[PDB]
Structure 1
Amino acid sequence: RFGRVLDAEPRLSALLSDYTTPAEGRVALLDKALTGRPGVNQTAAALLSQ
């Protein structure tokens, strides 16, 4: 599901893909945007964040 939404949302994929920005900030952005939602598997969220 996350791969499909990322594929259909190029802007978030581009922002997260860049490695120049701090990693912690990018993980926080992913959490507050995509993987911090209530109905998300914890293990999948952790894997995606890593």
Structure 2
Amino acid sequence: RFGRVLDAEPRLSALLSDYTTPAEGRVALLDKALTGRPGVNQTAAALLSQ
């Protein structure tokens, strides 16, 4: 589902895809945007974050 939604929003994926930006900032973005939500598995969250 996460891959599906990322593909649906190519702009978000491209923004997350810039390795130039700090890893921590993008990790926080994903946590507080998609990864961190009530209906998200913890293991999937951590895996995608790393």
Cα distance between partner residues in 1 of 2:38 and 2:18: 26
Identity %: 100
Q: What is the deviation of 1:47? A: 0.4
Is 1:25 aligned to residue 20 of structure 2?
no
Runs of 4+ in 1 over 2 A off after TM superposition: none
Cα RMSD for the two superposed structures: 0.5
Shift of 1:38: 1.0
Deviations 1:3-30 (A, max 9, x none): 0000001011001111000000000000
Q: TM-score, normalised by structure 2?
A: 0.96
Aligned residues, how many?
Answer: 50
| Structure 2: gaps of 5 or more residues | none
